[PDB]
Design a protein around this motif. Structure first.
Motif, PDB file in Angstrom:
ATOM      1  N   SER A 130      -3.517  -0.384   6.104  1.00 28.21           N
ATOM      2  CA  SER A 130      -3.613   0.784   5.199  1.00 28.21           C
ATOM      3  C   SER A 130      -4.660   0.576   4.092  1.00 28.21           C
ATOM      4  O   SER A 130      -4.336   0.552   2.895  1.00 28.21           O
ATOM      5  CB  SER A 130      -2.228   1.149   4.616  1.00 28.21           C
ATOM      6  OG  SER A 130      -1.263   1.463   5.646  1.00 28.21           O
ATOM      7  N   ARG A 182       4.667  -0.376  -2.571  1.00 28.18           N
ATOM      8  CA  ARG A 182       3.898   0.399  -3.545  1.00 28.18           C
ATOM      9  C   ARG A 182       4.728   0.654  -4.799  1.00 28.18           C
ATOM     10  O   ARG A 182       4.249   0.384  -5.907  1.00 28.18           O
ATOM     11  CB  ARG A 182       3.424   1.711  -2.922  1.00 28.18           C
ATOM     12  CG  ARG A 182       2.658   2.578  -3.890  1.00 28.18           C
ATOM     13  CD  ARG A 182       2.389   3.911  -3.216  1.00 28.18           C
ATOM     14  NE  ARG A 182       1.183   4.520  -3.774  1.00 28.18           N
ATOM     15  CZ  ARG A 182       1.092   5.102  -4.975  1.00 28.18           C
ATOM     16  NH1 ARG A 182       2.145   5.187  -5.805  1.00 28.18           N
ATOM     17  NH2 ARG A 182      -0.085   5.612  -5.357  1.00 28.18           N
ATOM     18  N   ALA A 237       0.824  -1.219   0.000  1.00 30.17           N
ATOM     19  CA  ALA A 237       0.000   0.000   0.000  1.00 30.17           C
ATOM     20  C   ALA A 237       0.841   1.243   0.000  1.00 30.17           C
ATOM     21  O   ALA A 237       0.363   2.303  -0.437  1.00 30.17           O
ATOM     22  CB  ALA A 237      -0.950   0.038   1.199  1.00 30.17           C
ATOM     23  N   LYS A 238       2.054   1.160   0.531  1.00 30.63           N
ATOM     24  CA  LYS A 238       2.905   2.338   0.664  1.00 30.63           C
ATOM     25  C   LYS A 238       4.371   2.010   0.505  1.00 30.63           C
ATOM     26  O   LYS A 238       4.732   0.835   0.341  1.00 30.63           O
ATOM     27  CB  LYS A 238       2.675   3.006   2.016  1.00 30.63           C
ATOM     28  CG  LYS A 238       1.309   3.646   2.078  1.00 30.63           C
ATOM     29  CD  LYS A 238       1.186   4.612   3.252  1.00 30.63           C
ATOM     30  CE  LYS A 238      -0.189   4.490   3.912  1.00 30.63           C
ATOM     31  NZ  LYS A 238      -0.032   4.597   5.378  1.00 30.63           N
ATOM     32  N   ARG A 239       5.177   3.077   0.461  1.00 29.37           N
ATOM     33  CA  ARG A 239       6.618   3.022   0.473  1.00 29.37           C
ATOM     34  C   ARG A 239       7.180   2.011  -0.549  1.00 29.37           C
ATOM     35  O   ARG A 239       6.852   2.082  -1.730  1.00 29.37           O
ATOM     36  CB  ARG A 239       7.029   2.761   1.904  1.00 29.37           C
ATOM     37  CG  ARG A 239       6.695   3.950   2.830  1.00 29.37           C
ATOM     38  CD  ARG A 239       6.656   3.551   4.302  1.00 29.37           C
ATOM     39  NE  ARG A 239       7.969   3.039   4.778  1.00 29.37           N
ATOM     40  CZ  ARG A 239       9.015   3.791   5.143  1.00 29.37           C
ATOM     41  NH1 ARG A 239       8.974   5.128   5.125  1.00 29.37           N
ATOM     42  NH2 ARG A 239      10.135   3.198   5.537  1.00 29.37           N
ATOM     43  N   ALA A 250      -5.074   3.765   1.406  1.00 29.46           N
ATOM     44  CA  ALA A 250      -3.958   3.801   0.474  1.00 29.46           C
ATOM     45  C   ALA A 250      -3.960   2.612  -0.488  1.00 29.46           C
ATOM     46  O   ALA A 250      -3.587   2.757  -1.657  1.00 29.46           O
ATOM     47  CB  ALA A 250      -2.645   3.862   1.261  1.00 29.46           C
ATOM     48  N   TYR A 263      -2.432  -5.682   1.943  1.00 33.70           N
ATOM     49  CA  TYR A 263      -2.262  -4.714   3.016  1.00 33.70           C
ATOM     50  C   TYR A 263      -2.731  -5.286   4.358  1.00 33.70           C
ATOM     51  O   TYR A 263      -3.436  -6.289   4.405  1.00 33.70           O
ATOM     52  CB  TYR A 263      -2.998  -3.400   2.677  1.00 33.70           C
ATOM     53  CG  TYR A 263      -4.513  -3.523   2.747  1.00 33.70           C
ATOM     54  CD1 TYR A 263      -5.230  -4.084   1.711  1.00 33.70           C
ATOM     55  CD2 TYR A 263      -5.214  -3.103   3.874  1.00 33.70           C
ATOM     56  CE1 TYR A 263      -6.610  -4.223   1.784  1.00 33.70           C
ATOM     57  CE2 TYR A 263      -6.592  -3.204   3.956  1.00 33.70           C
ATOM     58  CZ  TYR A 263      -7.285  -3.756   2.924  1.00 33.70           C
ATOM     59  OH  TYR A 263      -8.645  -3.879   3.014  1.00 33.70           O
TER      60      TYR A 263
END
Ligand SMILES: NC(=O)c1ccc[n+]([C@@H]2O[C@H](COP(=O)([O-])OP(=O)(O)OC[C@H]3O[C@@H](n4cnc5c(N)ncnc54)[C@H](OP(=O)(O)O)[C@@H]3O)[C@@H](O)[C@H]2O)c1
Ligand SMILES: NC(=O)c1ccc[n+]([C@@H]2O[C@H](COP(=O)([O-])OP(=O)(O)OC[C@H]3O[C@@H](n4cnc5c(N)ncnc54)[C@H](OP(=O)(O)O)[C@@H]3O)[C@@H](O)[C@H]2O)c1
Ligand SMILES: NC(=O)c1ccc[n+]([C@@H]2O[C@H](COP(=O)([O-])OP(=O)(O)OC[C@H]3O[C@@H](n4cnc5c(N)ncnc54)[C@H](OP(=O)(O)O)[C@@H]3O)[C@@H](O)[C@H]2O)c1
Ligand SMILES: NC(=O)c1ccc[n+]([C@@H]2O[C@H](COP(=O)([O-])OP(=O)(O)OC[C@H]3O[C@@H](n4cnc5c(N)ncnc54)[C@H](OP(=O)(O)O)[C@@H]3O)[C@@H](O)[C@H]2O)c1
Ligand SMILES: COc1ccc([C@@H]2CC(=O)c3c(O)cc(O)cc3O2)cc1O
Ligand SMILES: COc1ccc([C@@H]2CC(=O)c3c(O)cc(O)cc3O2)cc1O
Ligand SMILES: COc1ccc([C@@H]2CC(=O)c3c(O)cc(O)cc3O2)cc1O
Ligand SMILES: COc1ccc([C@@H]2CC(=O)c3c(O)cc(O)cc3O2)cc1O
Lengths: 248, 246, 239, 249
Positions: free
Chosen positions: A36, A16, A11-13, A39, A33
């Protein structure tokens, strides 16, 4: 038919950026995920807007427990449900926090060893049982032999992950499944970290006195899944700007 | 007064040789065991015959579970309650069996990762919290060339390397050294002699497996005054086996 | 405009494949050779037909001697003469043969340590002194599990690892990345026994070259001091 | 008879501690030296007054050249001439200085740094084995070999090669009953000409005690590897650095 990939913690960093580049390369993606949700859904939208029916989300907690295997089995099943195949597994999800030797200790064990090692092992098993350029990429740690003080459980989990990388490369090679790793040194630094501490870490890096971008980590993942790495298995590529070469 | 040592899985084979040689060097010993009560007790009696009140037994399962921390805390506590001190921890106990990728899987995880890695971690934490102090972990010389279909075992032994290194660093300010001994092929399993000979024939140094005593000698070195600057090191004791290509 | 690369031992086998692939990526190339003049020239001819004045040849013996530094400096100079720049150094040339502990021994030293390790160090020096810049050293995936009676060759490839790591650290401030590629068994019934040990398909030069192409690319701009094994899993196989 | 050992670069510092400790364990010793003639003879004297006819000296320059194989053969032959046998070789001699990538000629730096640290060990190993019980070889390695000092490429190369030799020779000499291992200091005795402030910078990095290894601590690990307590150990390199190699940047 486009190949498909599971990316955990996507979902992030870094996860992603990994999902993005895999999708830019032609893959359909399962965006896994834990917490999150906004996101994750927001990324799948962005990707489906670019090519319809090419991204789904899948929620699971990757803490070790007696249902972790059914969660891992479900992550892989979701790729086969959305896309009818599963070509790439990226084991990117990770817990990371101190566990000084001098949350209960059994929760710390379940989080740091479950997410970093046991979940990758169960995902790998489910990935293999469900089965062309098939491959697994584990997100390792360049600093695994020069560990952060008080991070013993984290370090144990990332050591175990190297062991898995090797063990699974050997055992899966006769089914055509390659297993490799990518080991960041310092890449995107913790959200919580202050600006002085980030620059302390940034000045240690020989190649440019800066952290890896998420995209730089993803580029190594893209290489190891590609047709240009078809003989490569059980290899771990450090992507750390030389940090692991620097003495105390 | 005599120093004191905990040895896990000390009833038989390598852990027994370790316990014996520590006892011969002047250590009091806690012989930890799981299922081998008769052998653990027969060892403690032999050792106590040589020197009264120098050996005790402690039963515990080292499988990962929500009681593992309390069990490991109790093993350390039993050394203090028996001898007044705990100078040496030897993390020797180990489960070892195949876990093919293609018992429930979570039991395999609890056994293979619990014994080989989480129990050593918990024991190390209790040992340190309660304080020539040293820890020795029984690692595996073949950890980078693993046996086919032993993924969880291999992961546990890798984790144990990480512990050795992480604990060495963190415990060096308290004067506690942490090291490992990594056998290659040592005492073999009921394994047929023809199968034993296939492993023996690969060992450059003498075409044979290490005795238990040979492994114990490296443990004796690491806990000795001759290794007072040695921390975070893993001594292979494989006869050159890890150097042999496929 | 177009970047330029030096490939040592580029006339045949792996070095040729590396030179071909760099040239296909838009590099101009210096094809170094020692004895294989005909093959070096024939390669240069195929590449120049594809794009004029993009491939030159350079003869040099890479045996360690009092003249090796001059030879190494001239290899780098030929890249600058032909092309005005030198972006990539690929240390590929290598001598390989047994040297039992139980040609004079000092000639064996000069060839196995010279070619495998000293010429790479002198080349790396000349390359840095003259300055996406990178060096790629052709290492060995089996360096820890060495062939019986190959001690000097093994010393030489170990030394090359040390160079890779030392030069990555020291050249990082100059923006020069230093990495390696370590093949397993890419061969010089014995052949089929080696093939049979490889986990991944029980079996090309191009596969090695693919890894080199990655390490020189803009996709590896934060990678330095890394050695990528390209062995099909062979280094993971116990005795 | 008592066993006999050759120790290279044994006049001072770690090589002296190693010869001393081996002499204290009952070995007869060949004390090799290059320039430190006075210190070599003075050590052989003290050992010989402790037990007569148990220490000799042997001068040799271990720089790579076309005569190095003959010098290495002669070192080994000195031990057999003096004592009738050669049980142990300790490759301790080492040149150590910067060779920046960006005075001595480069071919002289190669010959000293690679010659002393790797070539002379290989040739000595060859002569030791050909001229042949608990037989073994111990090589003085470097615990920091994968986290190298800046601008020390030829020294680092030399020490990597020595790791390669340790492994290759352990493999090839096993069938003859010769074990080959290494000992790898981190920071032990600092250079004579290093100033105190600089020494203290290195000391402060060591987790176990914030101090360098004593020469005797290095020697203890050598004694262990040559002893009957290491009879199944070959191809191993024991770090003796107080945790230094584990410390991140
Ligand atoms: N960043 C660096 O400097 C660096 C350095 C060395 C290695 N690495 C490794 O590279 C990979 C990516 O790094 P990163 O900084 O992007 O990681 P990160 O942001 O710390 O964590 C990645 C994701 O893992 C998921 N996660 C954490 N606990 C979990 C659990 N119990 N169940 C399921 N998911 C869980 C989280 O997902 P939700 O947000 O959905 O909860 C998180 O977003 C990791 O494996 C990391 O250890 C990173
Ligand atoms: N033998 C070899 O060739 C070799 C090779 C590489 C590494 N090693 C390592 O060297 C060490 C000693 O080897 P070994 O062959 O003597 O070991 P072993 O006979 O396989 O096992 C040692 C002891 O571990 C204990 N153990 C097993 N599962 C347990 C659990 N759930 N809870 C508590 N204890 C448990 C057992 O105690 P009880 O009998 O009391 O139940 C057993 O006697 C081990 O760490 C092993 O992994 C050995
Ligand atoms: N093939 C494999 O399986 C394998 C395995 C492990 C490592 N590697 C490494 O990968 C690289 C390429 O392997 P390869 O099999 O393609 O190599 P190779 O054919 O054995 O040798 C490569 C080149 O080195 C040159 N060379 C040899 N001795 C020389 C000297 N004294 N001076 C100058 N040049 C000399 C030759 O040049 P001329 O023909 O022009 O004289 C030849 O073109 C090498 O570094 C090798 O060590 C390969
Ligand atoms: N000291 C440390 O912190 C440290 C750290 C890492 C590794 N090590 C390794 O441990 C070993 C002992 O270290 P150290 O500090 O005691 O070594 P050192 O004093 O720097 O050198 C030992 C001896 O090597 C000999 N030597 C130098 N160049 C020579 C040549 N061309 N030919 C023959 N002999 C030569 C010298 O003999 P003469 O005096 O007779 O000329 C010198 O006394 C070395 O191999 C070293 O690299 C030491
Ligand atoms: C000295 O060793 C290390 C240095 C930095 C790190 C980085 C530091 C870091 O930023 C980081 C993160 O943000 C998330 C994660 O899952 C792991 C992380 O590790 C790890 C090390 O083992
Ligand atoms: C991959 O090479 C290997 C070969 C033999 C072994 C031996 C084989 C062996 O006998 C053995 C044992 O009996 C108990 C134990 O805990 C571990 C054991 O490991 C391990 C390896 O990792
Ligand atoms: C057991 O270890 C090894 C096995 C084979 C090889 C191959 C064997 C091989 O085919 C080969 C070659 O053709 C040229 C060269 O320069 C190096 C080569 O090495 C290297 C090893 O280190
Ligand atoms: C970061 O790496 C290192 C740090 C200090 C040293 C020491 C520093 C040192 O004192 C030293 C010496 O006096 C003689 C010698 O031959 C080698 C020596 O190395 C070596 C390293 O590789």
């Amino acid at each position: 038919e486009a190949p498909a990939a599971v990316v955990t913690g996507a979902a992030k960093r870094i996860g992603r950026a990994i999902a993005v580049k895999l999708h830019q390369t032609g893959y359909r993606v399962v965006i896994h995920y834990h917490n999150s949700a906004e996101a994750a859904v927001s990324l799948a939208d962005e990707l489906n807007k670019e090519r319809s029916n090419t991204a789904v989300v899948c929620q699971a907690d990757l803490t070790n427990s007696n249902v972790l295997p059914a969660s891992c089995e479900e992550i892989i099943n979701s790729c086969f449900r959305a896309f009818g195949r599963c070509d790439v597994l990226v084991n990117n999800a990770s817990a990371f926090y101190p566990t000084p030797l001098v949350k209960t200790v059994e929760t710390q064990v379940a989080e740091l060893i479950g997410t970093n090692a046991i979940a990758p092992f169960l995902l790998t098993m489910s990935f293999a049982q469900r089965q062309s350029n098939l491959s697994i990429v584990n997100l390792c740690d360049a600093m695994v032999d020069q560990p952060c003080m008080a991070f013993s459980l984290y370090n144990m989990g990332k050591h175990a992950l190297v062991g898995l990388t090797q063990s699974a490369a050997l055992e899966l090679a006769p089914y055509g499944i390659r297993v490799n790793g990518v080991a960041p040194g310092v890449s995107l630094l913790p959200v919580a970290m202050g600006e002085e501490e980030k620059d302390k870490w940034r000045r240690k890096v020989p190649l440019g006195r800066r952290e890896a971008s998420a995209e730089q980590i993803a580029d190594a993942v893209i290489f190891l899944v590609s047709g240009s790495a078809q003989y490569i298995t059980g290899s771990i590529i450090k992507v750390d700007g030389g940090l692991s070469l620097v003495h105390a």
